[PDB]
A paper describes a structure:
Neurospora crassa FRH (frequency-interacting RNA helicase) is a 124 kDa homolog of Saccharomyces cerevisiae Mtr4 (56% sequence identity, 73% similarity), a Ski2-like ATP-dependent RNA helicase that plays a central role in activating the nuclear exosome to promote processing or complete degradation of RNA substrates. FRH has been extensively characterized as an essential component of the circadian clock in N. crassa, a function which doesn’t exist in S. cerevisiae and is not dependent on enzymatic activity. Like previously determined structures of Mtr4 from Saccharomyces cerevisiae, FRH contains a largely unstructured (169 amino acid) N-terminus and five structured domains: two RecA-like domains, a small winged helix domain, a helical “ratchet” or DSHCT domain, and an arch-like insertion domain that includes a KOW module. The domain is composed of two anti-parallel alpha helical coiled coil segments (arm and forearm) that terminate with a β-barrel fold (fist) containing a KOW module.
The purified protein was crystallized in the presence of 0.2 M Sodium Citrate pH 5.6 and 19% PEG 3350, resulting in a trigonal P3121 crystal form (FRHTrig) that is unique from the previously published orthorhombic P212121 FRH structures (FRHOrtho). The newly determined FRHTrig structure retains the same general architecture as the previously determined FRHOrtho structures. Furthermore, rearrangements in the ATP binding site in RecA1 result in a conformation that is consistent with productive nucleotide binding and hydrolysis as observed in nucleotide bound Mtr4 structures. Thus, the FRHTrig structure appears to be more representative of the native nucleotide binding conformation. (3) The most prominent difference between the two FRHTrig and FRHOtrho structures is the conformation of the arch domain. Rotations about multiple hinge points in the arch result in a 30 Å displacement and a 70° rotation of the KOW module with respect to the FRHOrtho small cell position. Hinge points are observed (1) at the base of the arch where it projects out from the winged helix domain, (2) at the junction between the arm and the forearm, and (3) at the junction between the forearm and the fist (containing the KOW module). We conclude that FRH is a monomer in solution and the structural dimer observed in the FRHTrig crystal is likely a crystallization artifact, although we cannot rule out the possibility that such a conformation may be biologically relevant under some conditions not yet identified.
Author numbering: 141 to 394, 425 to 737, 744 to 846, 850 to 1106
């Protein structure tokens, strides 16, 4: 077969094994297909659904807009037909809820489990996040026994530095009998992933890949302060080099541009447009520049006011009053939207809704909006292409470009998607070209050990940590990489052992000396050529010695004058001195030519004809000695016998002072410690002339060889390291260390049996969030006498890694914080004690205390407005922190329960009741 169009298929088979057997036919059909129609299937869908129908797992690799969700539906239907259960894991928050709404309306027998809520836990199809899958798995719930199929939507999130590990963990933990549908972006090494699944779960895994986009993209560049946009990638995906070149020239010649771009987009009916930025602040800034315009008809204005109010009706005439709403509404009314994680969740949803219904023509959003469900536009504008990964500025990866740009082009309603990238004031071509002809990044494991992990593996009879390491995807990519690396290492060793033909050990001395001279000579040029020490002595006729650009020697010359041109940026390189020198190789220039260094002028002399003596211009970076003498120069100094005549007076002075000519100390009086750090540089210059090598001609041959050997040695050491971190033992060191920690702290015995404290520590699941320390805290007490509302605030002290400002701490609050920071200190201690790369101070200091009072007063009954007034943290971030906090609290009630402190557990529940109220207890618009 049937349909055909740029579709690649592959299959993964388990490692032998593959020996017996079970053949006899087992080759189609074999079952009927549920919910085929309505629309005709695309061949890539047909293929993947065939894989699923045959009960074989399959990884689909296609762009997000390509319609991957249809395949998920089929597995659910098939599961529902066989009275089986299926699990839809979504990577993150809101979209799982949305997908739940879609599946609920479709299949009815559907439930939802997130951090915030639980729906229909007996349903045949459970939508849940990966993290909950991890917890429920470690807990070993019997539900998992009935599960036949797991669909992973957006599986490429396994490459996430903090959350990828969760994905991997739950994959490894599933029973081999289970089958998987992996939905992914067009990653390049899908096959490898399939193969890993095949090995570890002893079953086939198909891979369906295709380079298919329903609506094609055109990419345009806008240079900053430029006059328009340049098409740089056309519908056929052909790169137009020349326009890029023109654009960069448009930037070499070169706030408000965003407004002009939007106005242009408006004039040509390219709306709706998503304008991406990478900071909430930048988002609001951009909206301010935009806000002069108005994109809605009075009827549209009416429509959005009606929809908005219809959403707000559930709240109250006091919640309606937060200034984020009152002053966001005039923007919405003008047809301008904003979207970022700082807004209230209810605004994120209602703004999404107003965008989907076509009431918002321009939407300024941060990256996260790019992965929202079914919300594309006609045009996408990148406000920049630089993102901080930390103390570095990254040009956004191809995968990011794909993911964001995929929101352009609306399948039903648009002929094409228009993508306009505003460019940075400075940018090299190879990086941009790499992005726009984007090759997707590997799905490389980001596995790392965690305390909840290790503890849980140890806790269960039939499984072990060593197992997990052996079966890890990271390790699989290692066991793949290693033979290539040992082959590189061997090639390097051969080159090393083969280039060892320079002989001598005087070379080593030479290298050391040369580099020492370059550094010390740099010190000497520095400061001594600076006007602050050197300048004052600018009399006419004074004899000065010239440093020469690199290291040559034009000898002593009489200063003629000194000029300084300002437009010449280093301190030393600024003043220009005209000096008379005993020039020979002229040639270039004539009189005044140049410029950057005297150029063509060759020193000496002695072997001249043709000596000349002329006044040449040099800059102040070029200097060295200044000497202590001045001759009287004639006022009319432009004649053969007279320039050369001054020269005659110079040779006679030089003949009069052997072992001289004595020089001016430049630093003495506007000391001198530097001089004793100055004679040695000369000594080393004598060591150089002493070296037999200095004369031979090979020289540079032997030197470049020495360099190669030293480089190769460094590279080799590095390769042995890469091999070490390609070997399971690196991570195993981390493991043995963490085992030391667990013994020394008392969570498990030396016989590797989990204790009650380990068992309670198990039930705390947080991204990096110490999880240990809370357990220690409990058994150490430090919670016995706190009221619930106080306890809330203290627990709030662990989730916020964001910045807030401006408050003092009362003593009755500063002290418990201090005591916990003390516990953190003992823990980071034992951590260093056990060879962990933990930086003992950053751990201890990671528990930020500046938000204790906001949460405390919220827990004591303050209204939302007031606590929003007590900090600069964004409203949405605040509600997010509360939501993690509630989830955390449920976890703490659990661990208290599982250590029999019934009183603590009930207390935490009561705390939940204080926190879990009003807007913080808000249900989702989708549910």
């Amino acid at each position: 077969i049937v349909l055909s169009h740029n579709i690649q298929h592959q299959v993964a088979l388990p490692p032998d094994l593959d020996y017996e057997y079970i053949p006899l036919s087992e080759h189609k059909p074999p079952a009927e297909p549920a919910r085929t129609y309505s629309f005709k299937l695309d061949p890539f869908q047909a293929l993947s659904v065939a894989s699923i129908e045959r009960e074989e797992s399959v990884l689909v690799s296609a762009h997000t807009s390509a319609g991957k969700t249809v395949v998920a539906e089929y597995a659910i239907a098939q599961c529902l037909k066989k009275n089986q259960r299926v699990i839809y894991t979504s990577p993150i928050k809101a979209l799982s809820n949305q997908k739940y709404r879609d599946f609920q309306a479709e299949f009815g027998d559907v439930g939802l489990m997130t951090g915030d809520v639980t729906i229909n836990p007996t349903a045949s199809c459970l939508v849940m996040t990966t993290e909950i899958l991890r917890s429920m798995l470690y807990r070993g719930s019997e539900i998992m026994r009935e599960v036949a199929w797991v669909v992973f939507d957006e599986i490429h999130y396994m490459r996430d530095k903090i959350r990828g590990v969760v994905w991997e963990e739950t994959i490894i933990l599933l029973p081999d009998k289970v089958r998987y549908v992996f939905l992914s972006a067009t990653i390049p090494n899908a096959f490898q992933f399939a193969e890993w699944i095949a090995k570890i779960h002893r079953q086939a895994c198909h891979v369906v890949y295709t380079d298919f986009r329903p609506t094609p993209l055109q990419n345009y560049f806008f240079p900053a302060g430029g006059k328009g946009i340049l098409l740089i990638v056309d519908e056929k995906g052909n790169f137009k080099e020349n326009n890029f070149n023109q654009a960069m020239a448009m930037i070499e010649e070169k706030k408000a541009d965003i407004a002009k771009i939007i106005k242009m987009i408006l004039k040509k009916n390219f709306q709706p447009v998503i304008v991406f930025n990478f900071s909430k602040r930048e988002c609001e800034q951009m909206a301010l520049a935009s806000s002069s315009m108005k994109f809605n008809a009075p009827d549209e204005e009416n429509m959005v006011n009606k929809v908005f109010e219809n959403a707000l009706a559930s709240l109250s005439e006091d919640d309606k009053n937060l200034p984020q709403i009152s002053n966001i509404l005039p923007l919405l009314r003008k047809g301008i939207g904003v979207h970022h994680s700082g807004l209230l969740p209810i605004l994120k949803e209602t703004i999404e809704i107003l965008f989907q219904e076509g009431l918002i023509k321009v939407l300024f959003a941060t990256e996260t909006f790019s992965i929202g469900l079914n919300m594309p536009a006609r045009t996408v504008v990148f406000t920049q292409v630089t993102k901080w990964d930390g103390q570095q500025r990254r040009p956004l990866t191809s995968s990011e470009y794909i993911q964001m740009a995929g929101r352009a082009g609306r399948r039903g309603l648009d002929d094409r998607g228009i993508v306009i990238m505003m460019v940075d004031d400075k940018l090299e071509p190879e990086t941009a070209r790499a992005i726009v002809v984007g090759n997707q990044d590997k799905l490389n494991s980001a596995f790392h050990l965690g305390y909840n992990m290790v503890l849980n593996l140890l806790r269960i009879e039939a499984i072990s940590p060593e197992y997990m390491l052996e079966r890890c995807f990271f390790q699989f990519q290692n066991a793949a990489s290693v033979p290539q690396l040992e082959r590189e290492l061997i090639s390097l060793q051969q080159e090393r052992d083969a280039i060892i033909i320079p002989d001598e050990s005087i070379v080593k001395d030479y290298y050391g000396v040369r580099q020492q001279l370059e550094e010390y000579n740099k010190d000497m040029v520095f400061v001594i050529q600076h006007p602050q020490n050197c300048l004052g002595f600018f009399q006419e006729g004074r004899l000065i010695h010239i440093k020469s650009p690199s290291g040559v020697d034009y000898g002593w010359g009489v200063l003629i004058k000194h000029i300084q041109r300002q437009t010449p940026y280093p301190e030393q390189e600024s003043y220009v001195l005209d000096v008379l020198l005993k020039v020979s190789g002229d040639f270039n220039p004539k009189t005044r030519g140049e410029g950057p260094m005297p150029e063509g002028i060759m020193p000496a002399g002695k072997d001249s004809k043709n000596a000349r003596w002329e006044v040449v211009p040099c800059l102040l970076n070029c200097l060295r000695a200044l000497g202590q003498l001045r001759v009287f120069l004639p006022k009319r100094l432009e004649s053969a016998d007279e320039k050369d005549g001054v020269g005659k007076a110079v040779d006679e002075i030089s003949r009069r002072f052997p072992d001289g000519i004595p020089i001016l100390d430049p630093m003495e009086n506007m000391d001198d410690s530097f001089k004793k750090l100055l004679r040695k540089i000369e000594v080393l210059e004598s060591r150089l002339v002493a070296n037999p090598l200095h004369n031979s001609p090979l020289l540079v041959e032997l030197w470049n060889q020495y360099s190669l050997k030293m480089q190769l040695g460094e590279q080799i050491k590095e390769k042995k390291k890469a091999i070490a971190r390609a070997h399971s033992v690196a991570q195993l060191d981390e493991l043995k260390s963490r085992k030391r920690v667990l013994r020394r702290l008392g969570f498990i015995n030396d016989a590797e049996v989990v204790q009650m404290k380990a068992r309670v520590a198990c039930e705390i699941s947080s991204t990096e969030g110490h999880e240990l320390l809370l357990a220690e805290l409990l058994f150490n007490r430090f919670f016995n006498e706190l009221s619930p509302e106080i306890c809330a605030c203290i627990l709030s002290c662990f989730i916020f890694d964001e910045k807030i400002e401006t408050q003092a701490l009362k003593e009755e609050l500063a002290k418990p914080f201090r005591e916990i920071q003390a516990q953190a200190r003992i823990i980071a201690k034992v951590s260093a004690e056990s060879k962990l790369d933990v930086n003992e101070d950053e751990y201890v200091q990671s528990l930020k205390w500046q938000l204790m009072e906001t949460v405390l007063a919220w827990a004591q009954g303050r209204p939302f407005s007031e606590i929003c007034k007590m900090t600069n943290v964004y409203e949405g971030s605040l509600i997010r922190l509360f939501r993690r906090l509630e989830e955390l609290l449920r976890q703490m009630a659990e661990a208290a329960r599982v250590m029999g402190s019934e009183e603590l557990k009930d207390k935490f529940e009561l705390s939940l009741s204080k926190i879990r109220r009003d807007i913080v207890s808000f249900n989702s618009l989708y549910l």
